[PDB]
Amino acid sequence: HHHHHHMVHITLDRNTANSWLIISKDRRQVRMGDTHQNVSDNKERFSNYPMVLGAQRFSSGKMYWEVDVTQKEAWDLGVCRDSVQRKGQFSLSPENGFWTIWLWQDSYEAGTSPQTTLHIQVPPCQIGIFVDYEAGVVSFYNITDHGSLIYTFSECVFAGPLRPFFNVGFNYSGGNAAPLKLCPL
Numbered sequence: 001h002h003h004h005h006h007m008v009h010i011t012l013d014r015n016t017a018n019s020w021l022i023i024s025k026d027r028r029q030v031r032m033g034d035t036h037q038n039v040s041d042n043k044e045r046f047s048n049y050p051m052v053l054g055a056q057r058f059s060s061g062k063m064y065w066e067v068d069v070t071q072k073e074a075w076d077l078g079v080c081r082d083s084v085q086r087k088g089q090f091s092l093s094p095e096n097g098f099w100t101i102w103l104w105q106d107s108y109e110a111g112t113s114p115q116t117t118l119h120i121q122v123p124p125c126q127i128g129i130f131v132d133y134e135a136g137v138v139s140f141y142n143i144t145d146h147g148s149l150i151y152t153f154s155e156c157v158f159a160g161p162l163r164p165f166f167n168v169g170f171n172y173s174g175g176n177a178a179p180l181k182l183c184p185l
């Protein structure tokens with residue numbers, strides 16, 4: 001791919017984070033804390049899952065960013081509508097306003113309904129996410145494997161402003177404490 005030149009500087013929005021997340025001072029890293037992080041509750045916070053949004057909102061153009069997933073066992077990444085549900089249980093699907101992939105139990109899947117099996121030969125340490133708003137495209141790239149394509153959502157019906165979307169995953173196993181990190185340009 002040749003998408004690197006649409007690179008954007010993404011920062012995390014503390015106000016949207018689940019109350020157990022810890023976001024770094026530079027707003028570029030997030031990890032699961034071992035307890036409630038002593039913040040007040042608000043209507044923006046994801047209640048049920050260890051999720052957080054980027055601060056940036058996109059309604060046009062082409063955007064590209066990269067996320068470090070080194071040594072994590074579980075995570076979700078992609079984009080979502082600014083108006084996605086925050087409270088209670090929900091599935092990650094385009095019908096619910098999410099364009100995502102994930103790692104779970106040693107398999108990678110795209111968040112279609114129902115979910116789609118991904119075929120990745122080289123487990124990624126860094127993921128590139130590309131959004132073309134006008135074209136209705138969200139694509140994922142394996143930075144560890146020379147930028148190879150992972151998955152493309154096409155004919156996307158965004159139906160609103162988009163935000164970068166992150167899930168650090170639970171850490172029931174004691175093997176998923178590592179952060180998600182936004183990689184430098």
Ligand SMILES: COCc1nnc(N)s1
Pocket residue numbers: 041042043047087
């Ligand atoms: C000010 O926030 C009001 C709230 N209502 N539901 C929550 N989860 S917190």
